Design an enzyme around this catalytic site. Structure first.
Site, PDB file in Angstrom:
ATOM      1  N   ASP A 163      10.321  -9.279  10.359  1.00  0.00           N
ATOM      2  CA  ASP A 163      10.450  -8.548   9.328  1.00  0.00           C
ATOM      3  C   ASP A 163      11.434  -7.460   9.883  1.00  0.00           C
ATOM      4  O   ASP A 163      11.414  -6.091   9.426  1.00  0.00           O
ATOM      5  CB  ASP A 163       9.348  -8.239   8.648  1.00  0.00           C
ATOM      6  N   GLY A 184       0.809  -1.455   0.293  1.00  0.00           N
ATOM      7  CA  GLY A 184      -0.053   0.059   0.155  1.00  0.00           C
ATOM      8  C   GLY A 184       0.737   1.138  -0.054  1.00  0.00           C
ATOM      9  O   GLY A 184       1.779   1.188  -0.766  1.00  0.00           O
TER      10      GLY A 184
END
Ligand SMILES: COc1cc(-c2cncc(-c3ccc(C4CCN(C)CC4)cc3)c2C)cc(OC)c1OC
Ligand SMILES: COc1cc(-c2cncc(-c3ccc(C4CCN(C)CC4)cc3)c2C)cc(OC)c1OC
Ligand SMILES: COc1cc(-c2cncc(-c3ccc(C4CCN(C)CC4)cc3)c2C)cc(OC)c1OC
Lengths: 290, 285
Positions: A127, A13
């Site tokens: 992550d 996004g």
């Protein structure tokens, strides 16, 4: 909320600098492709005791829909200096600024990893990378993006791995992630994946610390040994087949701080995950360095 | 672009352990705002997770507008606002004719069949069981149809929360339900649907007669019945709601009584499907 400036765009996004009650805020607008990260980040920020100087500050999360269109927003603090990845491109560090950065990251990671009774579950990030660390005006950093996080409680013996087919950034994946031998129902496995990625972040930062009038240019981990835009298999080749680790520039061994940091990052990079240091031990070691 | 998120809360229309529901205003239109207690956060998480998976859009499902978390944490669910209130509310202040009673029950069956059915594709949905169907979880729309509300306990093919005990099926009360079988949860919904059909049919006039509004099992359990109170009535004694004699003089109520019997079999696999209930209702009158 007024959206003012797009500060990031990818497949997740977009992130926008927004204005809310006169103040800058960060607005992440998720693609439907990444809707499971939106929901996971919302579950993680529901923990009031997650709040910490080295974790990106939560304001709100919303799902809005009319007909078949859904908007997914996460609203956080806005850090105008941007990510550590952005900061290191153009800026070099002295000893004090290098240690301040890496200790603040270790502080956030130890905060994530340790359960508080009474509280917060133990959390593994999955992550960690320099684009998921923001630089604050006090010279400390904060960790962002809990969309892949795993939660654990030793009090109830519950592991919550969530429901997200997203995987970690390929360049930062540990050997056991790349060879897919990681023990998926073991919380300690996830913490050890974070420690591998922390070592890579340490390396990226240390390269930018000046010693004896020498510094390295910014490079991402494994820049020299994989194709641009490396595949999962490209990373597996270098990390698992070739047993590559980031090279330690010999100029670091003239400097006590960089010699200590090279020792620390090597103890993050053992192929045996159980040999790697804990986030608490890394924080204690960095509290003692220079 | 400036995104206006100005919701004004105007009046409280409901208050429980769950939290509260408000009539609110958003861009000049009524919306309903459910404010969750932290004690019932799992219901907000479940409904949010479901709508993030599949954006349900159906005339007989309460219309989703937004799910908001604001930093303690405040959890808000924002939906369409139905000024006539819940079926439970509505049945206390009105009687029904044949057309309004059928339109009510077929609309509920339509909502439930939509939840229950798996549809393949990008534009599809997983099968869903509600797990807390009851007259307080159904809203009456201005057009005379109903919509089903509260997917906090729903399951796609919460947590401390369990179904409303008054409406629990026998296999829930005797703990024989096959908990890893999705069809089991559909059959629990059908049981509860049959109770709702009984609540509505009582309020349909025939030959100048109507029953007073009562909740299912009003005559055999206390208010806030215990799990044991319900188990003894439904499992041990195998009681079912009373069908009044006057229904058997009316073709509509006779057909509805047959339908509710086929929702209340002790054997869950004998119960009608929501699709079969719809078809039966389309052939009444
Ligand atoms: C959820 O709630 C309500 C929201 C709104 C509303 C307000 N601003 C903008 C929007 C919007 C505009 C455009 C798109 C599309 C256009 C086509 N394509 C390019 C994808 C994007 C989506 C959304 C909406 C839908 C109005 C409502 O009614 C008055 C709502 O209900 C209370
Ligand atoms: C990692 O993840 C999230 C990050 C943020 C976030 C918060 N403050 C500031 C930022 C930022 C601002 C500005 C730049 C500049 C850098 C250089 N230049 C060439 C253009 C842009 C970069 C970054 C971001 C991206 C918010 C998020 O959510 C709302 C995040 O997701 C959780
Ligand atoms: C069951 O569940 C949910 C229901 C609703 C909901 C939607 N429209 C209308 C209502 C309502 C309005 C008004 C009355 C009464 C009070 C005032 N007097 C004039 C008589 C009428 C009753 C009920 C509700 C309660 C929203 C929810 O979420 C936002 C629900 O939860 C999912």
């Amino acid at each position: 909320i007024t959206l003012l400036e797009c500060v990031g765009k990818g497949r997740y996004g977009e992130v926008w600098r927004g204005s809310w009650q006169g103040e800058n805020v960060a607005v992440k607008i998720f693609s439907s492709r990444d809707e499971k990260s939106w929901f996971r980040e919302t579950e993680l920020y529901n923990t009031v005791m997650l709040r910490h100087e080295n974790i990106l500050g939560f304001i709100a999360s919303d799902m809005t829909s009319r007909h078949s269109s859904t908007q997914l927003w996460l609203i956080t603090h806005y850090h105008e200096m941007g990510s550590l990845y952005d900061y290191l491109q153009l800026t070099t560090l002295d000893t004090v600024s290098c240690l301040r950065i890496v200790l603040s990251i270790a502080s956030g990671l130890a905060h994530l990893h340790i359960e508080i009774f009474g509280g917060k579950p133990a959390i593994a990030h999955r992550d960690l990378k320099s684009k998921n660390i923001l630089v604050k005006k006090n010279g400390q950093c904060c960790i962002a993006d809990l969309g892949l996080a795993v939660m654990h409680s030793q009090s109830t013996n519950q592991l919550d791995v969530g429901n997200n087919p997203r995987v970690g950034t390929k360049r930062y994946m540990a050997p056991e992630v790349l060879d897919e031998t990681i023990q998926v129902d073991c919380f300690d496995s996830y913490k050890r994946v974070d420690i591998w990625a922390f070592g890579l972040v340490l390396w990226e930062v240390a390269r930018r610390m000046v010693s004896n009038g020498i510094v390295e240019d910014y490079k991402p981990p494994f820049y020299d040994v994989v194709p641009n835009d490396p595949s999962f298999e490209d990373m597996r080749k270098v990390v698992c087949v070739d047993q590559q680790r980031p090279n330690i520039p010999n100029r670091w061994f003239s400097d006590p701080t960089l010699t200590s940091l090279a020792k620390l990052m090597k103890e993050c990079w053992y192929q045996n995950p159980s040999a790697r240091l804990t986030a608490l031990r890394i924080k204690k070691t960095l509290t003692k360095i220079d």
